[PDB]
Scaffold this active site. Structure first.
Site, PDB file in Angstrom:
ATOM      1  CG  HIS A  41      -0.489  -0.013   2.516  1.00  0.00           C
ATOM      2  ND1 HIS A  41      -0.937  -0.891   3.484  1.00  0.00           N
ATOM      3  CD2 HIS A  41       0.448   0.758   3.107  1.00  0.00           C
ATOM      4  CE1 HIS A  41      -0.294  -0.662   4.611  1.00  0.00           C
ATOM      5  NE2 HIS A  41       0.559   0.346   4.407  1.00  0.00           N
ATOM      6  N   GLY A 143       2.177   5.917   9.829  1.00  0.00           N
ATOM      7  CA  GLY A 143       3.566   5.708   9.377  1.00  0.00           C
ATOM      8  C   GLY A 143       4.255   4.568  10.110  1.00  0.00           C
ATOM      9  CB  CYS A 145       2.303   0.544   7.596  1.00  0.00           C
ATOM     10  SG  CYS A 145       2.503   2.196   7.031  1.00  0.00           S
TER      11      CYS A 145
END
Ligand SMILES: *CC(=O)N(c1ccc(-c2ccns2)cc1)[C@@H](C(=O)NC1CCC(F)(F)CC1)c1cnccn1
Ligand SMILES: *CC(=O)N(c1ccc(-c2ccns2)cc1)[C@@H](C(=O)NC1CCC(F)(F)CC1)c1cnccn1
Lengths: 305, 305
Positions: A41, A143, A145
């Site tokens: 993503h 942020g 991830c």
């Protein structure tokens, strides 16, 4: 003496954390040999999220579109591919701090350390359990991830989790390092709620054994129970069934304390039916289920890495 | 979202941990530049402990009596001295992994990460508070002594604690890296009990702010209180006095949530007088006091190192 929620030393994982940026979006990558693993993503914009076409989006990305930074040093991307919900960015430099490592898929009830990172820089370490409903109760801001979960056996780092998204209930979903999600979750902005969770019974028993070893013995009653009779009570209080495998894994704690597993089950049964009556066990006012039998053993035998 | 007891990444401290052996006894040392810091009781035998004459014992030790190992590599000791309750072993090799560092003496109520080590090998990381009674509630087995506590600000590791001994109540006592004990404790097998502890009120308020930020708001009442009226209630429940300094340090959390500190004090006052009535705050059934206002800020703003 003492019992604490304890993480693995994060040093070996710190040396693998990088920053991955594709246009607008920046998140964390795991750098092992000459490959950077990160959530796919990273290639989504703020308008792609409802149902992103990952294949189409990736096609339109070049190697040069991926800005990978190890500190202030840029790593040149010379190849990219998608495996399930993770990207594999081939870089021209192998990570000199690459530890001995494996990729495992953990079972529900098992625990691991998370190294929370932002912009490829680690902020903190904490211990998590994979919930029966295949979520984790972590601490993750925007942020986070690409932050990974791991176990360490002497020298080998077993990577078991990479953080992808948060559910509206504030619980967390991610993948193994092959990019297959734990549970039925998908990497898009859709209606997906976690199934009803359950208490990890074998972990609660482990934690009660930890309490006895540390001299917190008030809850030990004079009774025993059959496995079948225990599981009928457990079911009522939304505890998972205790299996012979669970009884067998508790053997070392039973041997150390001299308390038969079905005797500890009898004490747990009373705690569930009567509550703790305002008292604490290892400084907790409720029954803790994110300590595995091996977590208790490691912390009560002092196993190093 | 989510709130978890979170340690600093331990990587920079892992690279400083060595094994120190003087005859019979082996414990952990901290290797910075060409100096190894360790507890002085490494030179005590099992028969010296009631009242060891450290000056006499050290006199009879040579440089060569100190076996310092960085992994399987022996470090040659070329000098030794005693500063308070720590030894400083000068070695012929400077630690190539020496981080930017300071030695601080922390205040009661302040928190730090412990890297638990055995035989110079790190086993786990966990977050501690320096208790008002100058003990810590850690997880330490035999051979844990020399394990250090630390904070990290971007690149600088601030060492604040080295583990020395356990008290009969299973709580832990140690020194700063100048070897001065926190509290009235001494490095010998004597009658020394911790004074009565108190709850770190400013930390409980910080944790209640963390709860609101995470959307756990059930306990917020419609009332306010004076600082003086709050502290009279606090005193009854063995909470330390809340000072203007404490109110001022809570300012950023008050600004973020829009809840005045004296309004949060009013909600805390009700929780103390009425209890939590079987309910939880951030998954805890009692009021947590080992999260500083800065710990809450760091975990809710995602500060990296
Ligand atoms: C990567 C990250 O930290 N977060 C994130 C998760 C998932 C996506 C997706 C994009 C395409 N499919 S899902 C993007 C980013 C955040 C997160 O959810 N941030 C949101 C902030 C608001 C928004 F910008 F509108 C959308 C992204 C995250 C992850 N885990 C915990 C908390 N935040
Ligand atoms: C270093 C260590 O881990 N421990 C220890 C503390 C203090 C001494 C002292 C010697 C001289 N003055 S005090 C020695 C060792 C242990 C610990 O207390 N171990 C004891 C085991 C039984 C014994 F051998 F008889 C005496 C030492 C420690 C420290 N912290 C937590 C738990 N154990």
């Amino acid at each position: 003496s003492g019992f604490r929620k304890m993480a693995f030393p994060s040093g070996k994982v710190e040396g693998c954390m990088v920053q991955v940026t594709c246009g607008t979006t920046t998140l964390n990558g795991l750098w092992l040999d000459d490959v950077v693993y990160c959530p796919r993503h990273v290639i989504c914009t703020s308008e792609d999220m409802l149902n992103p076409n990952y294949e189409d989006l990736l096609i339109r990305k070049s190697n040069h579109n991926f800005l990978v930074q190890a500190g202030n040093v840029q790593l040149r991307v010379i190849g990219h591919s998608m495996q399930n919900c993770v990207l594999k960015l081939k870089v021209d430099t192998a990570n000199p701090k690459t530890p001995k490592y494996k990729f495992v898929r953990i079972q529900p009830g098992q625990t691991f350390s998370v190294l929370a990172c932002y912009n490829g820089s680690p902020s903190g370490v904490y211990q998590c359990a994979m919930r029966p409903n295949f979520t984790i109760k972590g601490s993750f801001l925007n942020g986070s991830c690409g932050s990974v979960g791991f176990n360490i056996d002497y020298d080998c780092v077993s990577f078991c989790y990479m953080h992808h998204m948060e559910l509206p209930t504030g619980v967390h979903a991610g993948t193994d390092l092959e990019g297959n999600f734990y549970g039925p979750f998908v990497d898009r902005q859709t209606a997906q709620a976690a199934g009803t969770d359950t208490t990890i019974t074998v972990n609660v028993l482990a934690w009660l054994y930890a309490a006895v070893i540390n001299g917190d013995r008030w809850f030990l009653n004079r009774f025993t129970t059959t496995l079948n009779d225990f599981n009928l009570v457990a079911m009522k209080y939304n505890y998972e069934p205790l299996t012979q495998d669970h009884v067998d894994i508790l053997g070392p704690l039973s041997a150390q304390t001299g308390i038969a597993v079905l005797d500890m089950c009898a004490s747990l049964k009373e705690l569930l039916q009567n509550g703790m009556n305002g008292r604490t066990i290892l400084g907790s006012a409720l029954l803790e289920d994110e300590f595995t039998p091996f977590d208790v053993v490691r912390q009560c035998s002092g196993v190093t890495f």
